[PDB]
Structures are given as C-alpha cells and as structure tokens.
Design a protein around this ligand. Sequence first.
Ligand SMILES: OC[C@H]1O[C@@H](O)[C@H](O)[C@@H](O)[C@@H]1O
Ligand SMILES: OC[C@H]1O[C@@H](O)[C@H](O)[C@@H](O)[C@@H]1O
Ligand SMILES: [Cl-]
Ligand SMILES: [Cl-]
Ligand SMILES: [Cl-]
Ligand SMILES: [Cl-]
Lengths: 984, 984
Amino acid sequence: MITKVTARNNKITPVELLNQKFGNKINLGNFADAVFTDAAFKNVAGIANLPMKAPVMQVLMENSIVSKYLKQFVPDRSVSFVEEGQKFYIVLEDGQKIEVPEDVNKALKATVSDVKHWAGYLTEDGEHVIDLLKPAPGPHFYVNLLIGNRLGFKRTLQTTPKSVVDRFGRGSFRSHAATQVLATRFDMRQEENGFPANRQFYLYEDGKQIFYSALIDDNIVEATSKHSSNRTVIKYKTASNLEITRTIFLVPHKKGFPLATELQRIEIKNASDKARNLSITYTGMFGTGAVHAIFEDVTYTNVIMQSAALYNDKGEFIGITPDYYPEEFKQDTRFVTMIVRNGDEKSFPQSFSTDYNDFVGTGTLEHPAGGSNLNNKLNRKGPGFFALGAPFTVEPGKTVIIDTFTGLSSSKDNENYSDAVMLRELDNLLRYFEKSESVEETLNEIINFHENYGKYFQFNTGNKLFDSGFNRNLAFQVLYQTFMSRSFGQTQKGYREIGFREIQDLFASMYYFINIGYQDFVKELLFEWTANVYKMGYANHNFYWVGKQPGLYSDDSLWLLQAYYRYIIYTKDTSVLNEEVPVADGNNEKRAVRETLKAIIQYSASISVGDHGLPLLDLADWNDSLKIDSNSIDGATKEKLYYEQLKKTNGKYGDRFMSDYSESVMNAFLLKLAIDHLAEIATLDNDTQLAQQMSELSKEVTDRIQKHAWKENFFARVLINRYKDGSYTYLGAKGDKLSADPNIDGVYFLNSFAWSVLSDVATDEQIAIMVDVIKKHLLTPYGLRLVTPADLNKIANDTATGHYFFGDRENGAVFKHASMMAVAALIKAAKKVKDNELAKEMARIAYFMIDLVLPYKNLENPFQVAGNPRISTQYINTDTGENIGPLLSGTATWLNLNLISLAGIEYTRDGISFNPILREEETQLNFTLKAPKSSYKFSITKPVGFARMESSEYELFVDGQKIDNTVIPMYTDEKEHIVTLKFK
Amino acid sequence: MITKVTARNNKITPVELLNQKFGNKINLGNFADAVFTDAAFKNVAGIANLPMKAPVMQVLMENSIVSKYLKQFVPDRSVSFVEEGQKFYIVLEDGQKIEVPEDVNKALKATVSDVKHWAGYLTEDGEHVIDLLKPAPGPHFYVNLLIGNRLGFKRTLQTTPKSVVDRFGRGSFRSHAATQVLATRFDMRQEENGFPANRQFYLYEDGKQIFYSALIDDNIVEATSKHSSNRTVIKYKTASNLEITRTIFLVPHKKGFPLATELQRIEIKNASDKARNLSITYTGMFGTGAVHAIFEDVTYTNVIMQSAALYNDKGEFIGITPDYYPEEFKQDTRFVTMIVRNGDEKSFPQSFSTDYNDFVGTGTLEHPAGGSNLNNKLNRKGPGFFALGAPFTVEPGKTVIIDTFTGLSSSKDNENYSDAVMLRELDNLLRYFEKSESVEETLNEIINFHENYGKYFQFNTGNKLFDSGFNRNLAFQVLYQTFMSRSFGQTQKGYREIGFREIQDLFASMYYFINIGYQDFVKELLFEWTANVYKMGYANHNFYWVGKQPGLYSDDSLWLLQAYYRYIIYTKDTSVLNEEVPVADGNNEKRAVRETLKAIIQYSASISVGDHGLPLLDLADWNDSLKIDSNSIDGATKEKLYYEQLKKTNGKYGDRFMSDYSESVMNAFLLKLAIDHLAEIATLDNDTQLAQQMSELSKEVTDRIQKHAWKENFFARVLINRYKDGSYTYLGAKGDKLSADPNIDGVYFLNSFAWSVLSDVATDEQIAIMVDVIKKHLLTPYGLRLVTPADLNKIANDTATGHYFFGDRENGAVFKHASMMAVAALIKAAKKVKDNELAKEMARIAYFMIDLVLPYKNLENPFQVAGNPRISTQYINTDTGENIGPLLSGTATWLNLNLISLAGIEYTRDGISFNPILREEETQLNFTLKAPKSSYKFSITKPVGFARMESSEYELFVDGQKIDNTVIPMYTDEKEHIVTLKFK
Ligand SMILES: OC[C@H]1O[C@@H](O)[C@H](O)[C@@H](O)[C@@H]1O
Ligand SMILES: OC[C@H]1O[C@@H](O)[C@H](O)[C@@H](O)[C@@H]1O
Ligand SMILES: [Cl-]
Ligand SMILES: [Cl-]
Ligand SMILES: [Cl-]
Ligand SMILES: [Cl-]
C-alpha cells in the first residue's frame, strides 16, 4: 500500500533532473542549482551556470518577486533561469525562452552577483569575514573558539576558561571542567550550543525596540562578523545610521581576578546628524550548577537557586549573581556586570530583570514585551536569566561604549572559599577595567601573545591563505587543544575529561611553548601525565582532577614516550628523567621518571603480551572499536591476577602474563618506537646500561613483528590467539578471512601502515606493497579511509560498524586524524626510501591528503565540503565530501607536524636533520624557525618536478659556507643563521 | 566593597513600600500591585484596590501610553494609580492628585477591568478557559495531560500513549516507556516541555505569512484555549475574520492501528465576504531515539538518521518518517501525515521541508523565511524536523478542515517488526479516518468513555466547581496516574519506571475500572505487581518491562496488601488468592498469591526485623530521605547473608535476621495494617488457620509498637539500635534529642501520626496528644507539613535540609500527598473516637487541608497560589503559598479516597459501613454511587454544626425502611437503592 523513499534512496537529484530536461537546450555550466517543485519530485525549478555550488534557488524562493513570478509556471512546469548578456530569461521544457520582467531580472542579478563569497571570505591574516544574512554550509562553519590564559598560575590545564562563539555571538562559556558560566544548550540541533539569549542585547528609542543583536531585518543595512585569533567582532549598521560593534574575548588571568571572565564590549556610534535618546537591555542565561538535573529534575534546578543583586561602595547597582542553597553548588559563584561609558561619565545599570517570563511577556525573545521596562524583581527561583538596562543619549558623530563582564569565581583557585571571595575578585576586575582604554589594551595583549606564540615556525610562501592558515590559525588551534583536549566546542558539550592519549596535542605545541619561555609548563604537563602511570607500566585512560580507568586501554602509556622523546631531544634536558613523580597507585609513593619509562616498556614488551610476544590488545587500543576480546580486563584486574599467577607457577616479576588474549600490532609499533625513543634518551643521558638494553630489546620486538605480523601484503592489525585450530589467527591483511567486501581479500587498516613506518619497522619493499594496497582500497577521492569493510562479528560480539550510514565516522569515513598519521608515515618514507618513484608517489598522496584537510581550502567549494575555514574538523563524509565536526581533532596536531616535516625539519640528538620534500610544482619554499637560543631563515629552491636529497643533486649552505652534513647544528649563539638549499 | 542582596534577603517588597508611602493618603484596599522603579529599590510605581493579587503593573508597563506617561514621574518619584468614580488619578508622595489624561485613563480602565479572570475561568463542567495573552501564575497552571486507551490490548500499562499540552499546544507526546514521538526539550525553563515547533502551524495568503499558531500579534483579535477531559481546543479570530480552531487528542487504540497516534484537527472558517486563497504549513520535531546522545553526542543523533517520504497507493505524497540506521532505533517507526478537506475534495500535502535551517532561513521560527515555499528536500541527516504544506481556497462562510496524524508504530506490539509494519498500520489508520465525521465521532467516543468512567461516584452539591472538579477532573487524573505513575508531565520528563509503591494509585482507581467492566484489568495489575515480589517477601523497588532494585526499600511489598485488601473486600473475589504467579526470583517458578502475601508479612514481621521486633528501615522506607543507616543492604544481599547466618547458628527459616540496623515505625504500621488485611481476607476465604494466625500476629505486632515505639509525645518514626549506651535510641517524638529547632523538643513526622491511625494502633488518648502536637508544630497557614526541623547529622548527616530554601520540598514544605494521608487518618479517627470535640477538631483540620489541595480553588487567588485548577500539584511552598509542580502526585489518589470517605463510604466484609462527616456549615450532602450489580442514591441532611453518628441523633432509611444497622448491604439486585440519613 504505502511506500517509503529515504533521502539516500531517492532516485534522482534536482540538478540531475534539471540537466535531463534542459542540459541540451541551454548551457547549464559547471555548477547549477535546482529544487523539486512538488513532493513527488516530478518537476524542477533551477538556475544555470553558477560560479560554485550554492543554495541559490532557496534564496530566490525567499524573494517575494521571484517567488510570485515562478508560480506562473511551477509546480506543473519545470523551468530553468539562464543569463544571456546581462539579462535573465526563464526557459521551459517546450523550448520557450522568456525574457523575465525587469523587477525579476533585477532580483535574480542581485542574488547571483556575489555567490562566490556567500560563505564569507578570509582576510590576508586568515580572519573569516561572514555575512550575517547568508546561509551556513554547516553547523561548524561559522564558529570561533576562545580561550583564556592561566600560564603562570595554578592548575593551568584544569582552570583555563573557554568559549564558543558563532557569527551572531551565540554559544556558551565555561570555567574549569564542564562548569558553565553562560548556559549550554543540549537540544536537537547541532547549531544550538547555548541558551539563545546568551551575549545578546536590545536597543530602545522612545520606548520602542529598534535593534536586537540576533535579528537582522529590513532596518539592518549592513551586518558582518569577523572571527579572528581569540576574539570575534560583529558589526551592524542600521537604516537610521547607528553603527554597532560587538567585541568578544576572554580575559587573560591576573592575580586577584575571578577564575573566568568573558568581556563583551558594545560600541554604539551615532552616525546621523541628530542626537538619539537610547537605552540598552543586555541579556544572558547563567548555566546551572546542577547540570544532570536538567534531564532528571528541571524543577530542582529552579528551586535550588535565586537571583541576587550586587551593589558597589556607593550603593549603586552593578549586576546580578545567581545564589545557590546547596553547598555543592556554592563552590563556584557567577556574576554579570556592565559599565556604560558616555563621554566623561561612567554609569552602571539603572534597572534589571531576572525572570524570563516577565521579560518576554506576551512577546518573543526577538521582540520581548518587557524588554524596555525591566521590573527590578529578584527572582526567588532559577533559571538565572538576566537583563541589565541603562539609558544613554549619544550625540551626532559620538560613540557610547558598554563594557560587559560575565564570569565565575571558584574554590578551585581559592582556599576558604565563599561568595565573599567572588565579591573581592569582581572588585579587582572592575577596578582593573575602570579606564576605557584598559579593554583595548588587554585585547592588544591577547593579539600580541598569539602573534608572538606563532613565531616558532613561520611559512613565507606568498600564498597568504596558506601562510595565515598555518602560522596563525593552526598554531592557535593546537594551543587550544593542548588545554582543552577534545572537551569543548560547538557540538562537544558533555563531560569529557582529558584522555591519556591526547598527550598527542603536546607533540606539536611543546615547541611553541618552549620558544616563548614556558619550558617549565611543558615539563609540568609531562610530569602530570607521568603521574597517571602505575608502577607496573599501564596508565589511567582518563584524568582531570583525578585519574581513572586503570590500564583500561592498551596503547595509552606508550604515547608518553613520544612526548618525552620530543621534549628530551629538543631541549637536551635529561634532568626530567630524575624527577620523583607520584605513581598512580597512590599511598604517597613516587618513582623517578626514568624508572616509570622503563616500566611502561616492560608492561607492553614482557608482561602484557600474547602468544607472539606482542602487546595485548585488552578492551581496545587507539582504535575505539576493536573490541575483539569480550572478556578483557583492565590493568588492576590483570595486576592482582598476574601476581597470583606468579605464585601459582613460582615465576618472577617480568614474566609473561599467560593468556589467550589477542595482540595489537599497532601497540607493537608504538612499543618499538617507544623503545628506540628510550634508547636515544639514555644515550643523550650517557646511561650506558639503559641504551644497550633498549637497543637490544628493539631488535627483539622488531623480530617479533616481522616474524609474526607481516601477513602476505600488509602488516596485520590484530593477532588472534584463541582458536588453536587456526580458524582465525589474524586481522588486517590478505587472507585474514575477515573482509566484508566481496571484491576485497583481507581487511586493511590505514594505521597498520602508518605505525609500521613511523616506528621504522617496515622495509622499503613492505612499504611498496602496502602503498599499492592503499592506492587500490583506502585512497578515495576525499582522502585516505581508516579501514576497509570488515565482518568482525565472525570473532566478536558486534556493536561497532552497526551505527552509521555509509560515509560517516566508522562506516568508511575519512577520519582526518588517522589520515594525518598516515601522511606522517608517507612523508617519513618519502625522505628515505631508495626508489625515487615510490618516494614521488607517496609525497603525491601526502599532499593530496593535506589539501583535503587544510581548513582554508574549505572556502573553495564551501556548500559541498562545509567544515570551517579556520579550524580543523574531525572527518570527511566519503559519500558527499562534507567535512563534519567536531572542531577539535588530532587532525590539527598532526597536520602541524606534517607540514613542518615536509618543510624538512626533524630534531635529532645531533641537531636538525634537514630533508625537505617540496611540491612538484613549487620552485621555492621559505620559512623562519625559532630555537631557544638561536633562529634560522630557510630557503629552498628547485626546478619544477620532484626533488629530494636522497635522489637529487643539491648544494647546501649554512651561513654562506657550503657544507656536507645535512644535520644542521642546534645553535645557541643567539644569532640568526641563513640556511639555503638548491636542487639541480 | 561590593555587597550582595538575595531575593529572600531583600528587606522590603514593592507593595510594602507602596503602603509605607501611600497607605494613609489613599485607600490601597485589600490587594494592590507595585514594582520598584530602579535597581536600588528606593521608589515604587503601584496601583490601588485590585480585586486580587495580579501582575497589573507588569501589563501596564507593556502599554506604550501608560509607560510613556509614567516616565514623567518615575524613576525619581514614587507614584500610585487610584480610581475614583470611573476615573483614574495618579498620586505622588507630596500629595498631588492628578487626573490622568483620557488616553491613560482608558488604558488603565481597560487593564483592570477583568483582573478577576486574568488566570482564566472554569466552565460548569470544570474545563479551564484560558486567554492566550494573559500572564501565567506558574509553569504548571495552563497545562493539560492527555492519555490514549489500550484497554483490551496487550501490555496496557506499558503501551498507553500520553501527551502534554499547554494553552498554545506546546509540549510533547510519548509512546511506550519514555519513547518520544514529538521531541521533549530538556533545557533551562520548566515552561519548555517540548521542541518549540511541536503542533504548530502557519497560514499564508498571496505568499505572505498571516498567522502562526504560537504568535499572538495585533492581527489576532480573539485567542482562547480550553483544557477539557482528555482534549484541548484552541480558538483564534483574525482581524481579517478568519476563525481558526485546533483540537488535540490521542487516538484510542483499535486493532491494526499504530501503537501511538496524536490527532490534531485544524478548522479554518472564512467568516468574511470574500474567498481567500490560503496555504498551511504544518510543523513539528520528531523525538530522537538516541535520547542519551542529546547530552553526550548531538552530532550522533543527527547522522544516525535521515528523513524519508511516504506515498500512498496513487503515488501521492502523504507525509514524513524519520529513518534510522542503527537496529536499536529501528524497533519504533515514527510518522506524520495530513489530510486537507475542502468541501468534498480531500487532498494530501503538496510540499514539504525536513531541514530546520532551510525552513527558518534568515528569519525566525515565529516568522520563517522558507515557510511558504517548502523545498521538497529530504534531509540526509537529523534532526527530524518536518513542515508539510498544502494550498486551499476557502469561500465566504465556508470551513476547511486539516486533520493531522502524528505517531509511532512499534515492535512492542508486533512480532517480526520492521518499518513495513508501520506502513500497514498507518494505512489502517488513514482508512479509518477517511470520512470527515470519523474524527468527531472518535472525540465523542473519548468524551463518553470518561463520562461513563466517572459514574462510579458523583457528588451533586450546590457547587458545580466542586462537583466537576471531583466527578470529572479528579476522576481523570487518578485514571491518568494509574497508567503513568509519576513518569510524564510538564516537568516530569526523564526516565521513570513504575515504582512498586505507586500501586497506591490503584487504591482509588480500581473501583472506577471495576464499574465499567474492567475487573480483569485490575486483577492483571495486581498480578503484575505480585510478580515483582520475591520468595522471601521483599520487592523490586521498580519495574517497567522487568523489575529491579530487589528489597532496596523496606516498605514496598507491604503496600500490596492494601491493594489486595481493597480488591478482595470490594469484589469478594478471593479466587485471586489461588492464582499461580511468577516469583521475581525468576528461573521458571510461580507461587500462589496466598503464599506470596503470607511471605510479605513474614519478611517484615519475623525476618527483616530489628531489636524490637519491628521491620528494619534498610536504605529507606516510604520517606525518600531517611538514609539513617549508611551500610544498609537490599534484600538479595540480606538473603545471601541470612542463610549463612542460619547455617552458622543452626537456625531455621523464619528466624530473625540478626543485626543492629534501625527499625521503621512507619513500616510497623504498614505491616500491622497488612496483617489485619490478610486476616480479613482469609476470613472471607473461610481459611480458618490463616485468619487465626494473622489475628494473633497482629496483637503481637501491636504490642511491639505500643511497648517500644510510643515515646511520651508521639509514635516515633525510627528506632535506633546501634548505640548500646543509649546515646540515641529513637527519632520522632519528644526526647529523641534530634530536633534542630530551638523551640521544639523532638522531631515529629506527620506520617507517624497518620499511619498509627490508619493501622488502628493508636488509642483515643494517643490520638489526642498527637493532634495537639500537630496543631502546635505541623499545622501551618498553608496546611500540614511533613516533618519538623531535624538535625540528622547527629547520627548520619547528608541531604534534603541540605538542598532547599525554607519552604520547598524537604526543607519544610506542605507535601500534599503526605498531607492527604494525614487527612485520611483524621477522617478515620473523627468517625470513631469517643470525644466528640476531638472528632470535631480533627474534621476541621481535615477540611482545612482538603480546601488547600482542591485544584479548582487555585483560581481563588491564582497569582499567589498558582498550581493548576484542574490537576493537583505536588507541594505547597510554606514561605509563599505557591502550589508547585509536578502535576502527578499521590495527592490526587488520596484526595479522592478522602472525599469519598468523608461522604461516608467504607467497604467492609459485610458491605458499606456508612458514616459520613459533613462540613459544619453544610445542611445537606447528596451523591450517587455505582456498584457492580446495583446503584445507590445517598442523601444526608443535618442542622448547621458538627454532626456524626457516634455522637449525634440520627435516623437512617434504606429503600423507605428505617434501619439500625449502619452497614448497608452490597446489593446485587440490579436496582437503584435510596439511602437517607437525617441528623437531629
Ligand atoms: O577514531 C577514534 C578517535 O576519534 C574520537 O573518538 C576521539 O576524539 C579520539 O580520541 C579517537 O582516537
Ligand atoms: O516524599 C517523597 C515522595 O515524593 C516524590 O519523591 C515521589 O514522587 C514519591 O514517590 C515519594 O513518595
Ligand atoms: Cl586503527
Ligand atoms: Cl565542536
Ligand atoms: Cl508535571
Ligand atoms: Cl515519613
């Protein structure tokens, strides 16, 4: 009877039908747009020859003139618009070509004129300028991320404030952990991160509303938003010639300040020739401290608090704080306050409301009935809605400035905490910002801090979109992720702690922090992770104020050797090996870093190993969904069993934990890398015993992998040991019998390839075979997939590949973080393999993939690829090409590593191993590099074509002296050194 | 420096300041209103002599004319409006009385004219007629609750659909458990139960929006909502003379229908003299199946689904369904469809949208830019927003009807489930409702079902608000709560299973179900609860599809004897005792009901007892927050330990579980009552051994309580056993040392009193002493509070007094359910105690408390007491008098029991023990009563004053024959019997 047609099953798209019905009567061009005219999809209305894909028919439909005109034909007749000369026609299926009326021609030309920039544009400095009326490519595209600065203060990692801001200023604002200052929204749409009133305000004249910051109507003649590094600026011009500017940023910490403050400055310039008697009403919604009760008991969230008013020394009202009854919700104290600056005079708000129902009344939030006449009623209940009102007269050509301060004080930074601490910190804050210029100076301080932070590595290529994208935007995103891990963005809203393995973010940012004098902060981060390693070598999978999930995941500890290796090789500071750091086991016990790093390797190399001497997989490793072993155990369960095994069998600590559990080949590669890392560390430490021991275990573990993990045409991913008859014995190479694609023999994991190379196990020949498999079955038009189809239920209890349509996340997406780890491999191999044609090919795939993740390139075809042109996104949908959030991802970290690696920079014990791999079409690459006691200017020139040191003639000069050593010293003479490389 | 003033600490209110500054320059009357003019609260603007408390100043400030006028004085000068003649003046502090201008006078008169009805009014049938522009007393006041009907179908309890509807039709709609059809909202405001688009629609004319169902602007000239029994009707008149009616109800189940369907009929009458070419766009938001991911991973909720279109036999589009990839979210299938009826023409929607961003575009939800021209694009992602569009021309005087059907099919009612089952059931539904009159006939069926249901008991007094409030509205709410327990309302939105102790709701509704032929349904509910009792006698604290929390709470099982007692005594159907029913222990074991009820009594009377032979408290009993014992155990942990105590001490089953755990005096009363119930059941069963056994255990248990729980002043609540030196030994009477009020010796729990009486333990003298304590320390101006202040830190410390401002929930509220259990005791004692003055006072307190909970009386002073005039609410705030939600509460169940008890009806073995307690001021009471094979008309007459059978002269007549036996037979002659009682 009734039939069902899904979005994906729908037989034909609008543009396909448009091409069918008009393609050989008019030139539809490279891009067109169309909509079905009816719910049965039989006819289309379309428009030919657009500069790019864009929702033009949608905007045309919003236009009363074009809309009414089209009804003379649609829905019963298909039509296409077409421009010839500079005049528009409408074409029918019967060949008629009708010059459209002038008012329609004008509307159509006005609509298509700037389609090329409908998703905004980037400034030379990489700032995203956004039209507030234009449609969004996706829910992450128009988003900026803000962060405070707790460097030099306690618990910098856990207490740095962070904010989400879209083009309209919507979003929310957090202090420590997931503590909400302004309310987050957890509702149906990705686009809604915050309660809708947050950061918004209204203007009134003669009692009538003339402006709302989140409503663009006919009385708004210009409205743009600019997302820059750590601030957002939003500008409006009214038809009445008011010029309104909003600037939003987080206050860097200063002693005595609240733990979190977000400043929004509102500038109102009267660009007309008559004074205007105006008022502002500034609104927002405090987050609840009782976040779980939003789901479980909303009435609880309301009755546990009340509104309270704040008054300065002179008895003047300054703002609002939400007052809580339960002690657990009185350890943070929120506030909002406003200063109105009008020539000489400063004033505080004259009125307030705290009841959303009294505020909106019979109206809407966009048009609130009580917005002009606030009732000065303190709500006995929550929620913590606030409205602050103040009148001002602004003379012709003059500007009034309204500075708002919203934030939170906390016990997390203050002993003997009470709301009295907040009142003192708020006073400190308001006195600091008493003078108008203090706001501008603080913004400039933020700008300069990030400008100086990025000087560690600066491309200068004349592609300013690339230069700014890397030098500024990617540098900021890796800083942001060092503090925030994956815990807070537009759609990352729930209680994420800090994953042990996101120590990865520090792999890239440590060099930046060291080169602005914060080496000690990097050590504090290392020691903090070190303190989440247990005595036996496994690690808490997660930690925030406290660590948890002991040895739950098998890869965690091994990543820390990469962090220590990076730090020790760059700094040559071996002292950290002697630091006494808490063991995660507690009871006030500390272990020297050296012995915890020796323990980490012993856990994965000797204890928690399987039948082949490879590290056990346990619940899973880096790959969230390799739950192969249904009866896994974490490291504390394994510890108690391991010790009773040793007494059962009379064994010795260090013996293999006997089991039939599966093994992770990826952990084997991580371990092998770890062991080489420790050997190099000990060498620099002149620890002769440890360097010999590791150098020898490295050879052993490599033997193990080569012998037991190379499987025909790939390094396998997992070795299976529970089937003594041989039913299944590996996964991740031809012949594993586990594929789920008829045309594919075997399952192939991109990371088996990547980590076999990054750990320096795979031979040139094994690289060639795996790259061929990659080209055939993992390389898509949208990049490198994480894995090929597998049917893992053949050995385990499902709940993995069963959740997503093809193209999303685990059902075959391009996971950009994994794609970047693979690029890191391709780049490492391209520098070293003997076969220059293999190297050329791998460098081609590297740059192909980098081009598909570079955020600024999202503006080339934004309504198809979406993403965000300043901030990385997690994955690409391989069905559509859409870059899909979230906005925090190891993609950014490894992209940074990879581009610096391709520029030729690798730090080794003896200095900088210089080996750049330029693009074939490039003929020069210039960049600057800071070091702690020197700097460098690098210049590389080459003919068009593939050039690399391994296989191309070259001359290398350092400070004008041709040299042969391609390891450039790490200079300490506080001079700039000129490095020139010339390929023939 | 900075000071803080909380809502509660604010020294003076606006009206108090108005009276200070004006009360003896003008007569302010019994009610006035005022607002502070500034954020420092130094001046007020107010208005004198209102008919009741109301937010008049708020509405006056929304009025351009009056607010402009007021600025001549405010903020600097206080002012009060006052009416003399039919003319207004404004009065200043200096004495000036200024006749306000005519346009101000007109606005003021228009504003105050109908303040008396600003919160709406009740029809003679108890329906709440509501003005859509007037302010709300609170977030529960303008709410209706809807329910389907699964009687005669499987798993009626678990599958009956339910909806929440406010005056604008906002809210949400669920199927089984917490499965959402239309999306719930979990956000900051109690007022927001649902996604804002739910149930709303737009009208267009010539491409322009002319109407949105959730926006009242100047083009709306009339807008009212009527909440009735199981439907809501909303009416609007436009300035252009369109008359729009929305009718919302749930479809009662018919074989082959979807498990849940909500019908909204939209009638559009053209009351003008010109035809109008209109279109409708009907919108909503499907709930996600991935509810937890709204908080954890909103992007997941989006990518796991896509929109899909539905087409009928002729290839015509009929609506939308959200299509899910994961199997776990494919076991329910949602739909929305619409039929447009225009004369004899029927049509289906011509267009649709499924992307909220394309729909709203540059506009707002109230004014969407894409709402007229839907794009017919199936969204590849969620969320499941939908817009369905259809054009229609309506001639002068004609009506177009648009019928919408929104719902869900489910595996819960269908084997071999897939979306093909939904398509068949949707076809069945649409065929059933193909004729226009089918919708009206189904509504009439619903109306008649509830009319017939309520016939069990019908008051016929002078007072139609009381009569409809009881006969219709309270009857409906007890029906609603029998299915829904406490699981779904305006602010009850999260996953609640059915509490074992909510079997209470059946205590009242069973009689109603039996008298419409659904005795078997009552037995099914009884058997279902019986199946959640374990062999040992404890119960799963909770159950929905399966039971859980075995013996976690100590009182649970005991309530079931009250349910069985009520059923067996009313029906005389002892057969239920012989039913073989699953034991919650599982395997495949069943036990006869008789033995599970003997087991329940044995658990609390012999096994799980403390040092005094009283039932152990365990984690808690009925009172959620008596976590006295921090090392408690549930009944399965106790069972495992009990048996190993038996083996290690040679004991026998039935011996006491040895411990120092605390004992619950409330459970003792529940057990004593349980035992009497069972003894009485066995008597009716002619089971001679069981009747003797229980009669004897009852004397024992009563001895136990009297000996060990009467504590000079009161029956204690808890007996404490862990302090063998006597530090603390009881809680709940004078001398327990646990008070936290300086002026109160002891802690007094209202339920100690209530259950000492309902179990028939307390002597006349103990009642007198306890009522005196109640009058002095538990009776407030807003009713009977649950308990007096206690400092339980002295023996444990924790919560409740930790969480709430004084007046709310556990910090001293009038918990209306507990207040009603106390009224049940007062009524029972008033009928029986020898002292007529004690009976008189207890009946006075009873009626005082009933008057504070009767919903219709919430309209006497609604802006102070709020609540809901048709549905009970949970508690009264003792600070303000506000009735605060939620809307589902044992208040409704026990209010029903109490008013029937006061009318004189108690069912006993031998019939109807008739003993009414009228109000002193009443001179007659008339009511009708149905029985399964007879009916009765009762008429009671008395002089003004206190009259009761125990102490007043009376003559009783039954069918014209004076009689002395006050136990009326339970007649079975299928005749109407006349019962007359005349007090002298
Ligand atoms: O592929 C899985 C990866 O993506 C996301 O689940 C997390 O943010 C990463 O920590 C993880 O490594
Ligand atoms: O006092 C506690 C009572 O109130 C609410 O928590 C629940 O709805 C009831 O089941 C409970 O008995
Ligand atoms: Cl992997
Ligand atoms: Cl994000
Ligand atoms: Cl509710
Ligand atoms: Cl109690």
